[PDB]
Paper text:
Six transmembrane epithelial antigen of the prostate ([name]) 1–4 are membrane-embedded hemoproteins that chelate a heme prosthetic group in a transmembrane domain (TMD). [name]–4, but not STEAP1, have an intracellular oxidoreductase domain (OxRD) and can mediate cross-membrane electron transfer from NADPH via FAD and heme. Each [name] protein has a transmembrane domain (TMD) which consists of six transmembrane helices (TM), and [name]–4, but not STEAP1, also have an N-terminal intracellular oxidoreductase domain (OxRD). Discovery of [name]–4 soon followed, and further analyses show that [name]–4 have metal ion reductase activities.
We determined the structure of human [name] in complex with NADP+ and FAD to an overall resolution of 3.2 Å by cryo-electron microscopy and found that the two cofactors bind [name] similarly as in STEAP4, suggesting that a diffusible FAD is a general feature of the electron transfer mechanism in the STEAPs. Similar to the structure of STEAP4, [name] has a domain-swapped homotrimer structure, where the OxRD of one protomer interacts with the TMD of a neighboring protomer. Overall, the structure of [name] is very similar to that of STEAP4 with a root mean squared distance of 0.8 Å (Cα). The N-terminal residues 1–27, C-terminal residues 470–490, and residues 332–353 (loop between TM3 and -4) are not resolved in our EM map, likely due to high degree of flexibility. The isoalloxazine ring buries deep in the TMD while the adenine ring of FAD forms a stacking interaction with Trp152 from the OxRD. The isoalloxazine ring is ~10 Å away (edge-to-edge) from the heme and the side chain of Leu371 protrudes approximately midway in between. Like L230 in STEAP1, Leu371 may mediate electron transfer in [name]. The distance of the isoalloxazine ring of FAD to the nearest nicotinamide ring of NADP+ is ~19 Å, which is too long for direct hydride transfer. A 1-palmitroyl-2-oleoyl-glycero-3-phosphocholine (POPC) molecule was built between the TMDs of two neighboring protomers, and two cholesterol molecules were built on the periphery of each TMD. In the cryo-EM structure of [name], residues 332–353 between TM3 and 4 are unresolved, likely due to high flexibility in this region, while in the structures of STEAP1 and STEAP4, the corresponding residues form a well-defined extracellular loop adjacent to the putative substrate binding site.
Residue numbers in the entry:
A (entry chain B), B (entry chain A), C (entry chain C): 28 to 331, 350 to 469
Write the structure that this text describes.
Amino acid sequence: ARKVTVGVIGSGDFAKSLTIRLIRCGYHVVIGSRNPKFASEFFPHVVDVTHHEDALTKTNIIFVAIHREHYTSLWDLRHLLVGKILIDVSNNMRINQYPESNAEYLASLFPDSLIVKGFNVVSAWALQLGPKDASRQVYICSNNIQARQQVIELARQLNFIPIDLGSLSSAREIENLPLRLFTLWRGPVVVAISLATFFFLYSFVRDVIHPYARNQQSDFYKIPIEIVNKTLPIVAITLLSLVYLAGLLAAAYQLYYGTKYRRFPPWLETWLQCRKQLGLLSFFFAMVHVAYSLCLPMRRSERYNEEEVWRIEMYISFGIMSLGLLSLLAVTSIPSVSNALNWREFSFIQSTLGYVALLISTFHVLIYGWKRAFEEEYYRFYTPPNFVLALVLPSIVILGKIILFLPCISRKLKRIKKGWEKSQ
Amino acid sequence: ARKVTVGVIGSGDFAKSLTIRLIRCGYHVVIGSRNPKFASEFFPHVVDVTHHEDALTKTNIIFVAIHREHYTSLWDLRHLLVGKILIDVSNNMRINQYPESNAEYLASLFPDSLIVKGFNVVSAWALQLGPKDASRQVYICSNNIQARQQVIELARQLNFIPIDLGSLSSAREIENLPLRLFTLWRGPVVVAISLATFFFLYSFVRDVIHPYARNQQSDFYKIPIEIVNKTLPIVAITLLSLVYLAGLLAAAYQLYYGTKYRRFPPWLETWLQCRKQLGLLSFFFAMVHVAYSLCLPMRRSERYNEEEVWRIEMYISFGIMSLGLLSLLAVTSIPSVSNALNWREFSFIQSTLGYVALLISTFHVLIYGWKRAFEEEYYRFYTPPNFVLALVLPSIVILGKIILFLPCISRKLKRIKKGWEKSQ
Amino acid sequence: ARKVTVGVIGSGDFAKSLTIRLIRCGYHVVIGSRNPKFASEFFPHVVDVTHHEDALTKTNIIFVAIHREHYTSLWDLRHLLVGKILIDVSNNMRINQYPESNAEYLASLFPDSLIVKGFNVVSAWALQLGPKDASRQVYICSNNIQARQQVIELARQLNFIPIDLGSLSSAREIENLPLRLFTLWRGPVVVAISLATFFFLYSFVRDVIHPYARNQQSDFYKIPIEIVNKTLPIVAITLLSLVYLAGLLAAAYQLYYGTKYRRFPPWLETWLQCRKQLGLLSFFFAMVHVAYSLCLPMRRSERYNEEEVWRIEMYISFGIMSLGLLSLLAVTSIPSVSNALNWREFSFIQSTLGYVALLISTFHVLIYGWKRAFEEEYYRFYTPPNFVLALVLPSIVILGKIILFLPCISRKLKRIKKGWEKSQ
Ligand SMILES: Cc1cc2nc3c(=O)[nH]c(=O)nc-3n(C[C@H](O)[C@H](O)[C@H](O)COP(=O)(O)OP(=O)(O)OC[C@H]3O[C@@H](n4cnc5c(N)ncnc54)[C@H](O)[C@@H]3O)c2cc1C
Ligand SMILES: Cc1cc2nc3c(=O)[nH]c(=O)nc-3n(C[C@H](O)[C@H](O)[C@H](O)COP(=O)(O)OP(=O)(O)OC[C@H]3O[C@@H](n4cnc5c(N)ncnc54)[C@H](O)[C@@H]3O)c2cc1C
Ligand SMILES: Cc1cc2nc3c(=O)[nH]c(=O)nc-3n(C[C@H](O)[C@H](O)[C@H](O)COP(=O)(O)OP(=O)(O)OC[C@H]3O[C@@H](n4cnc5c(N)ncnc54)[C@H](O)[C@@H]3O)c2cc1C
Ligand SMILES: NC(=O)c1ccc[n+]([C@@H]2O[C@H](COP(=O)([O-])OP(=O)(O)OC[C@H]3O[C@@H](n4cnc5c(N)ncnc54)[C@H](OP(=O)(O)O)[C@@H]3O)[C@@H](O)[C@H]2O)c1
Ligand SMILES: NC(=O)c1ccc[n+]([C@@H]2O[C@H](COP(=O)([O-])OP(=O)(O)OC[C@H]3O[C@@H](n4cnc5c(N)ncnc54)[C@H](OP(=O)(O)O)[C@@H]3O)[C@@H](O)[C@H]2O)c1
Ligand SMILES: NC(=O)c1ccc[n+]([C@@H]2O[C@H](COP(=O)([O-])OP(=O)(O)OC[C@H]3O[C@@H](n4cnc5c(N)ncnc54)[C@H](OP(=O)(O)O)[C@@H]3O)[C@@H](O)[C@H]2O)c1
Ligand code: HEM
Ligand code: HEM
Ligand code: HEM
Ligand SMILES: CC(C)CCC[C@@H](C)[C@H]1CC[C@H]2[C@@H]3CC=C4C[C@@H](O)CC[C@]4(C)[C@H]3CC[C@]12C
Ligand SMILES: CC(C)CCC[C@@H](C)[C@H]1CC[C@H]2[C@@H]3CC=C4C[C@@H](O)CC[C@]4(C)[C@H]3CC[C@]12C
Ligand SMILES: CC(C)CCC[C@@H](C)[C@H]1CC[C@H]2[C@@H]3CC=C4C[C@@H](O)CC[C@]4(C)[C@H]3CC[C@]12C
Ligand SMILES: CC(C)CCC[C@@H](C)[C@H]1CC[C@H]2[C@@H]3CC=C4C[C@@H](O)CC[C@]4(C)[C@H]3CC[C@]12C
Ligand SMILES: CC(C)CCC[C@@H](C)[C@H]1CC[C@H]2[C@@H]3CC=C4C[C@@H](O)CC[C@]4(C)[C@H]3CC[C@]12C
Ligand SMILES: CC(C)CCC[C@@H](C)[C@H]1CC[C@H]2[C@@H]3CC=C4C[C@@H](O)CC[C@]4(C)[C@H]3CC[C@]12C
């Protein structure tokens, strides 16, 4: 029933938190540091703190809890670290800082050891605490199977969820993972902000400034949130149109080149990768628009034609249908739901029901426009009304999709999708 | 640091996509085809394309990327495929097309080889691309442990998420998996459509046609979406009633037979299996009803008694309570949330809070009916009003559930639930 | 192709359901009972029911499907259970009933056997049925690797999802797991109920009783659900304030003590652990408030100043912003979404956007209060209006957070967060 000894190199924040987590989870830790005299009182009395040359002798699994630039300080400990699993927990301060990942550099430093990458994601504060809602998954990568399984078992005993990802070819991925902060959302968010700013300025120029000399009824105790009420929906529908224009453009490139075995242009690849983020931003903005259209027009201050009844009911119904379809798409976007669906079912949901949602949203805007545009006042300052642009982009998307259904084009796109593209 | 060679049989769409994915993920591929002269220019220069008899010699893991009906074309390669892992990636065009699954048929063809089922779910386009939101899980089944783990490691190196499911007894399941398209939703969707059509026709006959001779105030510029506003809620509540009538009927069958060790009738089994789909359809229709009741009655065109204040506030509150409980049930229906809950907690949530939601919905409809039914006009054309049916079904469900609480019945149902049913 | 024999000890409800599940999943079961004459007709004809001393001879994996207090009845079968995997499926009737878990007690009883904990979560009715939406994950813990993997494979063949959690140090956790019923929700729910009751009584005393002698316009055909409309929002905002006051107090304790390596007081630890439950309760109550504010003020019975337009639009917009941020936080609270986010991204979302949501909610309440408080009538009965308390708690939270941004305090808190706390 003797506890298994685990070695740790260095005495820092991560070393102390790791030692706490190991001791609480039924382990015995041997820590090697340059000056055990200095670091001995830091650690509890059940921690055996000695020199570098001593800790390695009495352990098999060693956490290299030092920074990358100090790895060469372990050069003298080359023949002691023979056949001993070295768990590399290091992290970089910048994505792609070095030509090779930290684990591969360590492996090149110590050819005879068994280098296992892992435990870098935890923050030396989740190690001190118990289970945490973000830092409960640890990714482990080693080119040696046995050492990888030993480290996975160690992670299991430390109340973690081990995740196996390969043979140090994945070390770069799990070193870049702790450093990323919504990398795929930056582009969609910038696009949404740009669209919102442009439509805000368009409404300000057309709706307010052009009749401002006529009326001039607003001051700083007024705000253009009638304009944000006209800006959120257009941004949402434009984001949906951008979600599906990427697929249209991919089809166009495939038809033009004649093969699917040609890499898309880098901008098209980035556009295709962030379609989920664009769609979720569109759903969020559509929901905010629904909230505004419910709360504001019906407020207590708002209390201060049969064909019109027709129109109002009909485009409200179309908006509700589109919102329901978008809600289905967003629900399927949860990782568990997406993984629980076949690729055929997921493709049906996303592609088909999103195209249907875009078409229904186009009708929902189109009715409003149909009896808000024929009056020459709203065709103001030579500038089309707000709904005209929010129609012109989904119109392009929908006409493209319909073009893709033509028999000649459908046949030339099936002959590509199904492999016979251009034999050579 | 030499790359591991992986063999592939055949040169088709799947073979080419698989070769691309293998080469990009640090592998070396040897492809065997009938005519290497023909297929050599198809594949890159780092691909060794030779005959069938040559590729097997220089590899250990071989992807049998050919259709099932051509498996007998490998009969001559029986003594070369001795002890070599054969990954069967084949798929059928129809569920339960053949008496035995593809993997088992291959294993019977080659008794001495190690047959591993896997990689059929990916679509030869997710292999070409990177990570995909539906095709990132691969299911692997082999009756040999070592070969199964080798194939799982191979899937890990190919940026997939290996899932182990057994010993080729699960081959049929993961061959039917790529072919299913919402199999459990078909029944609930057909039931919902039937209910919606019946209630639409009922409202058309009662609300419109019966006084149509009296008024005749509608034309084709009118639509019965006052009727869909009366059809969505009834369909939602009826779907909930059908969700819980299945449990009531299962209890009735258990009490009648005296044991739980008797298989339910096939219709009852299918009803019990699709309870989740019926409940989610009910939640979706209830949410659509909430959206209609918010957007339509308050529209700008809609602008064109204390006990009544009482009633309106009270049934709105009951509707909100029921919607909240249904939202809790739907949130627990996510696979991650369901797996994160104990069976006791999940049972409490679903059973208890869904019965409470059904009861509260019954009250919410019942108040509306209580002061919309006593007037003889709404008891029109000898036909009960719309809410009467939406009450009569949940009333049956609730009276059944209350009957199940009787001391004699509760005791006879505990003596069953807890094992003492009928000893023999 | 001979089936693998699996032994089962005892003949009860769990034994029968387990035997059914094993037989259906291609196994052959040998059941040992005290009186095979009695239990033989219970089980099918393909089940070999014999004495205790006979079943062990013809099997290797044995399910000890008897209660803990009867384990000593297997004392005579000590030398027969040598090297045989014993899967302990037992459960306790109370959390922490015994000093050592059931699996560890069994292991102490039989030192020479290989004890594996598992299959306790399933309810002897999910074993009889097929896949179930709560009982499809089984947790397995053994201090022997090989036996643990054998039991995991057995669980895989039984259409389960094996989960490995360690070396019998996790046996207590997975014995307590079937017994817990929302353990972390009890405290937050009691707090929410207490807040709701207190604010209901406060509104009853101030809003109704104090002018009750003045007007007396209500009877039992009236209800205080104008008061629940004033109670739900305050409870939601107070729950959010309590969510973040825990972090403020943790920071205060860290600054006072000078280290993060000191355990928080038990009440603070329990407060910190249940922050997710408090936040989700706050989100649920905020959504119920949104539903009430939409449905009730706009009802058909409700149909029975430019700066005010200003105010109404502005605080509605702030409420919508806060609801959107809370929705983002709740979406990230799904286990799949939380596990799919880096700890940095999850920390950003939760901490930063929740503080922003709290600030925006404070403004949203504050505008309403700003032009509903300056009238001396609402400062009624020497008691502050309802919004004043719902402001005073988030005000304390926000001033604390701002204090944490002071340069001296920020520096003393970074010197703690980053390890240099108090060297010894
Ligand atoms: C609310 C919301 C949530 C969303 N969530 C997600 C999400 O979680 N994940 C996600 O990925 N997206 C998500 N999306 C976006 C969604 O994936 C896209 O809208 C949808 O995939 C577009 O379908 P498509 O037909 O344009 O593209 P696809 O079907 O993906 O194909 C794009 C292009 O590739 C071609 N192509 C397709 N299959 C093949 C093949 N086998 N061989 C050759 N060429 C082929 C098509 O012809 C087309 O030119 C979401 C969108 C919304 C609105
Ligand atoms: C929005 C929504 C979402 C839903 N999501 C899901 C979902 O994700 N998954 C899902 O499965 N369902 C889901 N449902 C449906 C839900 O499961 C059912 O409403 C609920 O289980 C019915 O409870 P019950 O008491 O009728 O049935 P159960 O408790 O399941 O039992 C049915 C019958 O079996 C008997 N029985 C139960 N336990 C035993 C036992 N141990 N031994 C012998 N007999 C027993 C009962 O007496 C009864 O006769 C959802 C419903 C809704 C509205
Ligand atoms: C709708 C909703 C859903 C929610 N869902 C969840 C959920 O799923 N999971 C969950 O956990 N919470 C959840 N929450 C609550 C959420 O986690 C908290 O609101 C948030 O974490 C508080 O941030 P903080 O800065 O106060 O605390 P934290 O950042 O967690 O830190 C608390 C204290 O620890 C200190 N500290 C932090 N990091 C370190 C460190 N490295 N070293 C030393 N000291 C440190 C801080 O200074 C502070 O004193 C939810 C809340 C809401 C409203
Ligand atoms: N939150 C975290 O801290 C965290 C989280 C994840 C991963 N990590 C990784 O874990 C490792 C430990 O980080 P840390 O925060 O603990 O680092 P730190 O506080 O900077 O500690 C540096 C450690 O390196 C040792 N060291 C050895 N040779 C050295 C040299 N020449 N110069 C300087 N130091 C030398 C020191 O040990 P002596 O006492 O013997 O000098 C000391 O224990 C890093 O690789 C980090 O990327 C940290
Ligand atoms: N999207 C997909 O394509 C996909 C996805 C998942 C699974 N799969 C499975 O993967 C396998 C490959 O599918 P595929 O689409 O690549 O098929 P395909 O395009 O029809 O190719 C058929 C292949 O079979 C070989 N073959 C051998 N003997 C043959 C014979 N007698 N008659 C005809 N062909 C013979 C051919 O090789 P030669 O050049 O030597 O003649 C050719 O490479 C199938 O089992 C399929 O079910 C495919
Ligand atoms: N839903 C469930 O039932 C469920 C779920 C999860 C886990 N479990 C666990 O699985 C085990 C089986 O539970 P169960 O519900 O089947 O129990 P049960 O109905 O009470 O059966 C008791 C069993 O213990 C045997 N036994 C041996 N020595 C005994 C003694 N001295 N006194 C009494 N019985 C003795 C009996 O076998 P003989 O015929 O030879 O006397 C009988 O088969 C328990 O440990 C339970 O915690 C049960
Ligand atoms: C319950 C669901 C919805 C309701 C009740 C609703 C309501 C409305 C209303 C009343 C208008 C008239 C303009 C205004 O009031 O400011 C409008 C316009 C608009 N709707 Fe919606 N909507 C819904 C969903 C959606 C969705 C999901 C989309 C797009 C994905 C969308 C796209 C638009 C657009 C772009 C406009 C712009 C028209 C203009 O600014 O002139 N709507 N909506
Ligand atoms: C915020 C939540 C809800 C609100 C505001 C609401 C509102 C209403 C209103 C105003 C009516 C009167 C009939 C009408 O206006 O067309 C009604 C009727 C009805 N409600 Fe709801 N409801 C809600 C939730 C629900 C839910 C969740 C269910 C069932 C699961 C439900 C079941 C019904 C049914 C069946 C009727 C039919 C009455 C009739 O057609 O005569 N309601 N609801
Ligand atoms: C769409 C979102 C929201 C809308 C439309 C809304 C609407 C309102 C309205 C109209 C009032 C005036 C008092 C009343 O009508 O009873 C109010 C008050 C209040 N709001 Fe909201 N709200 C929203 C979201 C929120 C959220 C998310 C919170 C807190 C997390 C919140 C906190 C409060 C509080 C505490 C009051 C109390 C004021 C009082 O009782 O005097 N609101 N809200
Ligand atoms: C993050 C996502 C949303 C980015 C999508 C933004 C779109 C509108 C941007 C991003 C990159 C852009 C492309 C970048 C480069 C070129 C080449 C030149 O001929 C101008 C047009 C063209 C082809 C641009 C078209 C618009 C474009 C595709
Ligand atoms: C929204 C838009 C971008 C959707 C795509 C429309 C355009 C780009 C597509 C639709 C029809 C396509 C054409 C269909 C047929 C041919 C004939 C052959 O020579 C291949 C290219 C060519 C000439 C295609 C070029 C691209 C094309 C013109
Ligand atoms: C997919 C789900 C929702 C199906 C539920 C539909 C219900 C209403 C249908 C489906 C199958 C049907 C049963 C099929 C067969 C019989 C036998 C005969 O005596 C008529 C009634 C009875 C017992 C039917 C009752 C109604 C029933 C249970
Ligand atoms: C909604 C409905 C279907 C719920 C179930 C109600 C009916 C079917 C149930 C409830 C009470 C049950 C009875 C309770 C007691 C007995 C006595 C004994 O001889 C077993 C059968 C019998 C006669 C049961 C038959 C089924 C029964 C009548
Ligand atoms: C389950 C969660 C929400 C519990 C949070 C409830 C809060 C308000 C309660 C729970 C435990 C309580 C603490 C328990 C003990 C003490 C010590 C004494 O000096 C009184 C105050 C103090 C410090 C209490 C302050 C309020 C407190 C922190
Ligand atoms: C909402 C509230 C609880 C937030 C926290 C505010 C209080 C408790 C915090 C904020 C500023 C803190 C002080 C900042 C600086 C010092 C000086 C040094 O001697 C450490 C303790 C001491 C004296 C701290 C004690 C705790 C403190 C006073």
